[PDB]
Amino acid sequence: HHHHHHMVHITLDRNTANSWLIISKDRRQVRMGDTHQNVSDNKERFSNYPMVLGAQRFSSGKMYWEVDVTQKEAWDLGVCRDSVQRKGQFSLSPENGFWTIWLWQDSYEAGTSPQTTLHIQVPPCQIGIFVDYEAGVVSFYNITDHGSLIYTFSECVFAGPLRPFFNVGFNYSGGNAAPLKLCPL
Ligand SMILES: CC(=O)N1Cc2ccc(N)cc2C1
């Protein structure tokens, strides 16, 4: 891919974070804390899962960013509508306003309904995410494997402003404490 030149500087929005997340001072890294992080509740926070949004909102254009997933066992990445549900249980699907991929139990899957099996030969340490708003496209790239394509959602019906979406995953195993990190341009 040659999407690198649409690079955007993403930062995380503390106000949207699940109350157990710890976001770095530079707002470029997030990890699961071992307890509640002593913040007030608000209507923006994801309550049920270790999720957080980017601060940036996109309603046009082409955008590209990269995320480091080194040594994690579980995570979700992509974009979502600004108006997605925050409270209670929900599935990650385009019908619910999410365009995502994930790692879970040693398999990679795209957040379609039902989910789609991904075929990745080189487990990624960094993921590239490309959004073309006008084209209705969200694509995922394996930066560890020379930028190879992972998955493309096409004919996307965004139906509103988009935000970068992150899930650091639970850490029941003790093997998933590592952060998600936004990689430098
Ligand atoms: C609401 C719910 O079922 N959750 C969210 C959450 C957050 C942190 C921890 N340690 C456990 C759980 C389970």
Side-chain angles (χ1 to χ4, degrees), residues 1-184:
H1 73 94
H2 302 286
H3 296 314
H4 308 101
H5 69 102
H6 301 293
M7 181 70 82
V8 291
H9 185 78
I10 300 306
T11 62
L12 299 170
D13 182 349
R14 308 192 154 280
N15 285 339
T16 69
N18 176 277
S19 62
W20 286 47
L21 296 183
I22 303 170
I23 292 170
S24 63
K25 179 158 53 178
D26 67 1
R27 299 182 310 104
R28 300 275 287 173
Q29 312 192 16
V30 57
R31 67 187 180 88
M32 188 55 163
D34 282 328
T35 190
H36 186 292
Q37 293 306 128
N38 202 34
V39 291
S40 58
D41 192 39
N42 70 53
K43 65 197 204 166
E44 299 178 66
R45 295 199 186 289
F46 288 98
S47 62
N48 287 41
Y49 311 104
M51 292 167 179
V52 60
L53 304 184
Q56 290 70 37
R57 286 47 152 10
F58 302 123
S59 284
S60 71
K62 294 175 181 185
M63 286 68 58
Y64 178 76
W65 62 98
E66 292 179 356
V67 185
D68 194 298
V69 299
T70 299
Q71 65 148 135
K72 292 192 67 55
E73 300 174 343
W75 49 261
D76 315 323
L77 288 174
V79 292
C80 65
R81 295 184 187 141
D82 60 354
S83 60
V84 295
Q85 176 187 347
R86 306 305 170 84
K87 309 302 184 181
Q89 293 167 106
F90 55 87
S91 51
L92 298 177
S93 63
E95 306 102 92
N96 290 338
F98 298 91
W99 296 266
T100 63
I101 68 170
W102 63 75
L103 173 60
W104 170 250
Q105 299 192 166
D106 202 32
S107 74
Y108 298 91
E109 302 174 322
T112 54
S113 179
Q115 72 265 29
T116 300
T117 295
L118 301 173
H119 300 96
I120 313 181
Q121 175 63 19
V122 177
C125 300
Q126 298 90 32
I127 300 289
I129 302 174
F130 176 68
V131 180
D132 184 335
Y133 198 100
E134 276 71 32
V137 169
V138 184
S139 293
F140 298 84
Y141 297 93
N142 184 342
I143 302 314
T144 306
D145 181 45
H146 314 277
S148 58
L149 181 67
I150 296 170
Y151 192 79
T152 291
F153 292 89
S154 69
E155 319 189 273
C156 297
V157 179
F158 298 134
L162 291 174
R163 297 182 69 179
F165 175 78
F166 309 87
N167 185 357
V168 298
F170 292 104
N171 187 28
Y172 294 108
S173 63
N176 199 36
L180 293 175
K181 309 188 192 172
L182 283 153
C183 306

PDB file of all heavy atoms in Angstrom, residues 18 20 32 47-49 170 172, ligand 1:
ATOM      1  N   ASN A  18     -12.911   3.421  29.409  1.00  0.00           N
ATOM      2  CA  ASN A  18     -13.275   2.585  30.577  1.00  0.00           C
ATOM      3  C   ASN A  18     -12.430   3.054  31.761  1.00  0.00           C
ATOM      4  O   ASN A  18     -11.253   3.405  31.646  1.00  0.00           O
ATOM      5  CB  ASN A  18     -13.064   1.143  30.191  1.00  0.00           C
ATOM      6  CG  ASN A  18     -13.328   0.218  31.346  1.00  0.00           C
ATOM      7  OD1 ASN A  18     -12.474  -0.006  32.187  1.00  0.00           O
ATOM      8  ND2 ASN A  18     -14.502  -0.316  31.349  1.00  0.00           N
ATOM      9  N   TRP A  20     -10.930   1.599  34.116  1.00  0.00           N
ATOM     10  CA  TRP A  20      -9.719   0.844  34.512  1.00  0.00           C
ATOM     11  C   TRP A  20      -8.537   1.155  33.605  1.00  0.00           C
ATOM     12  O   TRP A  20      -7.459   0.636  33.862  1.00  0.00           O
ATOM     13  CB  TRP A  20     -10.014  -0.631  34.504  1.00  0.00           C
ATOM     14  CG  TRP A  20     -10.856  -1.065  35.676  1.00  0.00           C
ATOM     15  CD1 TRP A  20     -12.001  -0.477  36.148  1.00  0.00           C
ATOM     16  CD2 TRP A  20     -10.595  -2.194  36.502  1.00  0.00           C
ATOM     17  NE1 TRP A  20     -12.466  -1.185  37.242  1.00  0.00           N
ATOM     18  CE2 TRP A  20     -11.657  -2.260  37.430  1.00  0.00           C
ATOM     19  CE3 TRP A  20      -9.607  -3.181  36.495  1.00  0.00           C
ATOM     20  CZ2 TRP A  20     -11.714  -3.276  38.397  1.00  0.00           C
ATOM     21  CZ3 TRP A  20      -9.662  -4.173  37.458  1.00  0.00           C
ATOM     22  CH2 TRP A  20     -10.733  -4.239  38.348  1.00  0.00           C
ATOM     23  N   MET A  32      -4.386  -1.597  30.342  1.00  0.00           N
ATOM     24  CA  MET A  32      -5.313  -2.065  31.399  1.00  0.00           C
ATOM     25  C   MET A  32      -4.637  -1.862  32.760  1.00  0.00           C
ATOM     26  O   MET A  32      -3.476  -2.245  32.954  1.00  0.00           O
ATOM     27  CB  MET A  32      -5.671  -3.532  31.138  1.00  0.00           C
ATOM     28  CG  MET A  32      -6.770  -4.101  32.049  1.00  0.00           C
ATOM     29  SD  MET A  32      -8.325  -3.102  32.006  1.00  0.00           S
ATOM     30  CE  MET A  32      -9.530  -4.231  32.697  1.00  0.00           C
ATOM     31  N   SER A  47     -18.515   1.072  29.531  1.00  0.00           N
ATOM     32  CA  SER A  47     -18.657   0.481  30.895  1.00  0.00           C
ATOM     33  C   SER A  47     -18.235  -0.979  30.920  1.00  0.00           C
ATOM     34  O   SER A  47     -17.684  -1.414  31.978  1.00  0.00           O
ATOM     35  CB  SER A  47     -20.092   0.666  31.358  1.00  0.00           C
ATOM     36  OG  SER A  47     -21.025   0.017  30.536  1.00  0.00           O
ATOM     37  N   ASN A  48     -18.491  -1.775  29.912  1.00  0.00           N
ATOM     38  CA  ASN A  48     -18.429  -3.248  30.000  1.00  0.00           C
ATOM     39  C   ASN A  48     -17.086  -3.803  29.525  1.00  0.00           C
ATOM     40  O   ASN A  48     -16.793  -4.986  29.757  1.00  0.00           O
ATOM     41  CB  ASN A  48     -19.567  -3.956  29.277  1.00  0.00           C
ATOM     42  CG  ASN A  48     -20.912  -3.833  29.990  1.00  0.00           C
ATOM     43  OD1 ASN A  48     -21.272  -2.780  30.502  1.00  0.00           O
ATOM     44  ND2 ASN A  48     -21.642  -4.944  30.017  1.00  0.00           N
ATOM     45  N   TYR A  49     -16.327  -3.017  28.746  1.00  0.00           N
ATOM     46  CA  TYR A  49     -15.128  -3.539  28.062  1.00  0.00           C
ATOM     47  C   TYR A  49     -14.014  -2.488  28.164  1.00  0.00           C
ATOM     48  O   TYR A  49     -14.280  -1.293  28.289  1.00  0.00           O
ATOM     49  CB  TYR A  49     -15.432  -3.744  26.575  1.00  0.00           C
ATOM     50  CG  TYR A  49     -16.712  -4.497  26.286  1.00  0.00           C
ATOM     51  CD1 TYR A  49     -17.872  -3.871  25.842  1.00  0.00           C
ATOM     52  CD2 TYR A  49     -16.762  -5.870  26.471  1.00  0.00           C
ATOM     53  CE1 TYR A  49     -19.057  -4.563  25.643  1.00  0.00           C
ATOM     54  CE2 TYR A  49     -17.927  -6.597  26.209  1.00  0.00           C
ATOM     55  CZ  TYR A  49     -19.064  -5.939  25.777  1.00  0.00           C
ATOM     56  OH  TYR A  49     -20.231  -6.620  25.527  1.00  0.00           O
ATOM     57  N   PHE A 170      -9.140  -7.644  28.083  1.00  0.00           N
ATOM     58  CA  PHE A 170      -8.999  -8.059  29.495  1.00  0.00           C
ATOM     59  C   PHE A 170      -7.626  -8.669  29.706  1.00  0.00           C
ATOM     60  O   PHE A 170      -6.926  -9.048  28.782  1.00  0.00           O
ATOM     61  CB  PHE A 170     -10.160  -8.963  29.942  1.00  0.00           C
ATOM     62  CG  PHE A 170     -11.491  -8.259  30.026  1.00  0.00           C
ATOM     63  CD1 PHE A 170     -12.452  -8.449  29.047  1.00  0.00           C
ATOM     64  CD2 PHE A 170     -11.798  -7.428  31.080  1.00  0.00           C
ATOM     65  CE1 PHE A 170     -13.668  -7.782  29.119  1.00  0.00           C
ATOM     66  CE2 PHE A 170     -13.019  -6.760  31.138  1.00  0.00           C
ATOM     67  CZ  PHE A 170     -13.955  -6.991  30.173  1.00  0.00           C
ATOM     68  N   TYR A 172      -7.249 -11.425  32.191  1.00  0.00           N
ATOM     69  CA  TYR A 172      -7.524 -12.583  33.089  1.00  0.00           C
ATOM     70  C   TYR A 172      -6.305 -13.494  33.115  1.00  0.00           C
ATOM     71  O   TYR A 172      -6.107 -14.201  34.185  1.00  0.00           O
ATOM     72  CB  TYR A 172      -8.772 -13.354  32.632  1.00  0.00           C
ATOM     73  CG  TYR A 172     -10.080 -12.618  32.728  1.00  0.00           C
ATOM     74  CD1 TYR A 172     -10.722 -12.176  31.578  1.00  0.00           C
ATOM     75  CD2 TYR A 172     -10.706 -12.451  33.952  1.00  0.00           C
ATOM     76  CE1 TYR A 172     -11.898 -11.428  31.687  1.00  0.00           C
ATOM     77  CE2 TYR A 172     -11.875 -11.705  34.061  1.00  0.00           C
ATOM     78  CZ  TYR A 172     -12.470 -11.217  32.919  1.00  0.00           C
ATOM     79  OH  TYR A 172     -13.662 -10.523  33.080  1.00  0.00           O
TER      80      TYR A 172
HETATM   81  C1  LIG B   1     -19.109  -4.952  33.522  1.00  0.00           C
HETATM   82  C2  LIG B   1     -18.341  -6.237  33.458  1.00  0.00           C
HETATM   83  O1  LIG B   1     -18.909  -7.325  33.387  1.00  0.00           O
HETATM   84  N1  LIG B   1     -16.989  -6.165  33.478  1.00  0.00           N
HETATM   85  C3  LIG B   1     -16.188  -5.008  33.041  1.00  0.00           C
HETATM   86  C4  LIG B   1     -14.946  -5.192  33.865  1.00  0.00           C
HETATM   87  C5  LIG B   1     -13.917  -4.291  34.106  1.00  0.00           C
HETATM   88  C6  LIG B   1     -12.867  -4.674  34.916  1.00  0.00           C
HETATM   89  C7  LIG B   1     -12.837  -5.948  35.488  1.00  0.00           C
HETATM   90  N2  LIG B   1     -11.772  -6.322  36.303  1.00  0.00           N
HETATM   91  C8  LIG B   1     -13.873  -6.854  35.243  1.00  0.00           C
HETATM   92  C9  LIG B   1     -14.925  -6.464  34.429  1.00  0.00           C
HETATM   93  C10 LIG B   1     -16.142  -7.239  34.023  1.00  0.00           C
END
